[PDB]
Design a protein around this ligand. Structure first.
Ligand SMILES: Nc1ncnc2c1ncn2[C@@H]1O[C@H](COP(=O)(O)O)[C@@H](O)[C@H]1O
Length: 508
């Protein structure tokens, strides 16, 4: 059952049951469906249906975000979710490449808020449309793009992964059918909508007729209310990055007691530490844990495996799971061909979950996406192997990293740092003693300026980055040098620069 129809049916069958809860505000499947209907209609009066141009949906987790998502697709346009944490210049970059002709801000802005060169509408303004009613024939369908989520681009600009209705539905049916989330449960949502991890709970929840319970950035920044918010939620399904639950597990009060109704843990987006898995099993004895791996380029995740003490003892490195029933995953080699179980190669995903490609970026698509055996496939860039039928994920082949579950390209950061007038050269070092990156270091070969102190030159640069890079991509540490070790007749030697930098960290 197409996603939109299930939501439509829940709006008709049980129009009074909540579909979305976010900071005191609520929304029923009836309200969600009628408002989204109104939005779709108001949208078609502001942009041409000539082409399926993206519509940026701006905000955090207010009810209008979910309404606009549905309004966009019901109107036949894919939406680009944009979180408040994404800075002006990046947004401008996204607007630029996506060809978007409409940005909806879930609420009236503030003192110096929206300042973009694209049609702007508050969600409230749109919702003042009248009859506002599109017909099913308008809704995006089949291989038409449902949403485009942008992610870090190694060349310096973000790239938009296009996810079709078929992509999404394929993933959604998977979750609802193969996992204990059906029955109209309460799904937690901690991930901002601009990261597809959010999709793992958002759409499987709406299709299953459950209730989405958001936990905003605000609550997260206040440990007291965070837990307060959680206890009152009565959530059943917990979906988040391992890092987030690990921060919560940092408190003793976080256990079955806090979330008496918690029965399902959905993790994805980064390595799920064995320890974090053990604790969960101890503190939440009434809930099962699930581990799923996958890149944004393949619609959230394409594998899964229930974590049990039996699965924990059998390996000192938790597996990512077995392939999505309709997905094929291979372990290609440096040459481009397959590999037998046990060998270490690059994980390759082929199947209905794979994206058609990066928006407006053919050369980039061309390198990562390809037709294999007749089915669209994607080179994940991850290194792994398959043992006993289950994929094991270990490290990347390139310079893309994960910081606290945040995906970023070390080369996009270096690009921006080097794009400064004050900078002549730059290399970003991920401090990852164990394996998990704790923070980033920026080794910089400066340009003769006129500043006084160092946090002077360091502040001017960061202030710049703050404009084009989300906060989690701004290096924590800045150290300066005279020149960089460019090995391989040019390719700098990252390993050595790191060593030097850690040594310098000992000299106060
Ligand atoms: N379950 C997992 N275990 C280990 N690493 C993962 C897992 N899921 C995702 N990843 C990593 O995160 C990447 C996808 O990042 P993202 O597109 O931001 O969701 C994967 O290619 C891996 O590098």
């Amino acid at each position: 059952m197409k996603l939109l129809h299930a939501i439509q049916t829940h709006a008709e069958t049980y129009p009074q049951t909540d579909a979305f809860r976010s900071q005191g505000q609520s929304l029923t499947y009836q309200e969600l469906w009628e408002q989204s209907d109104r939005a779709a209609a108001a949208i078609q009066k502001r942009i041409s249906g000539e082409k399926k141009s993206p519509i940026l949906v701006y905000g955090h987790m207010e009810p209008h975000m979910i309404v606009s998502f549905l309004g966009s697709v019901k109107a036949g346009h894919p939406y680009i979710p944009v979180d408040l944490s994404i800075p002006s210049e990046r947004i401008a970059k996204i607007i630029e490449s996506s060809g978007a002709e409409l940005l909806i801000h879930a609420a009236g802005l503030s003192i110096d808020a929206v300042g973009q060169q694209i049609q702007t509408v508050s969600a409230e303004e749109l919702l003042e449309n009248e009859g506002g009613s599109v017909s099913q024939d308008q809704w995006v369908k089949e291989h038409e793009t449902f949403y485009i989520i942008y992610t870090s681009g190694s060349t310096g600009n973000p790239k938009g992964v296009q996810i079709s209705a078929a992509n999404l539905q394929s993933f959604t049916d998977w979750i609802c059918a193969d996992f204990p989330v059906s029955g109209g449960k309460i799904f937690l949502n901690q991930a901002p909508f601009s990261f597809d991890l959010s999709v793992m709970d958002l759409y499987p929840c709406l299709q299953s007729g459950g209730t989405l319970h958001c936990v905003t950035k605000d609550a997260v920044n206040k440990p007291k209310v965070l837990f307060e918010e959680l206890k009152k939620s009565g959530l059943n399904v917990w979906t988040s990055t391992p890092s987030f639950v690990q921060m919560c597990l940092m408190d003793p009060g976080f256990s079955q007691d806090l979330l008496p109704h918690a029965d399902t843990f959905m993790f994805c987006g980064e390595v799920l530490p064995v320890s974090v898995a053990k604790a969960l099993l101890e503190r939440f004895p009434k809930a099962k844990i699930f581990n799923t791996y996958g890149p944004t380029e393949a619609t959230v995740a394409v594998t899964s495996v229930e974590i049990t003490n039996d699965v924990i003892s059998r390996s000192e490195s938790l597996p990512v799971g077995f392939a999505k029933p309709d997905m094929n995953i291979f372990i290609m080699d440096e040459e481009g061909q397959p590999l037998p179980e046990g060998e270490k190669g690059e994980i390759v995903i082929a199947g209905p979950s794979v994206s058609r490609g990066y928006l407006g970026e053919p050369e980039l698509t061309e390198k990562a996406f390809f037709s294999h055996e007749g089915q669209w496939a994607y080179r994940t860039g991850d290194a792994g192997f398959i043992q006993d039928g289950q994929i094991f994920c270990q490290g990347r082949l390139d310079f893309q990293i994960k910081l606290h579950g945040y995906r970023m390209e070390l080369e996009e950061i270096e690009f921006h740092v080097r794009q400064s007038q004050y900078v002549r050269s730059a290399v970003v070092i991920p401090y990852q003693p164990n394996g998990t990156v704790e923070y980033l270091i920026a080794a910089i070969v400066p340009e003769e300026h006129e500043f006084e102190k160092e946090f002077q030159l360091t502040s001017a640069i960061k202030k710049e980055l703050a404009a084009s890079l989300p906060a989690y991509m701004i290096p924590r540490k800045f150290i300066y040098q005279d020149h960089i070790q460019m090995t391989a007749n040019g390719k700098i030697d990252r390993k050595r620069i790191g060593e030097e930098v850690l040594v310098r960290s000992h000299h106060h």
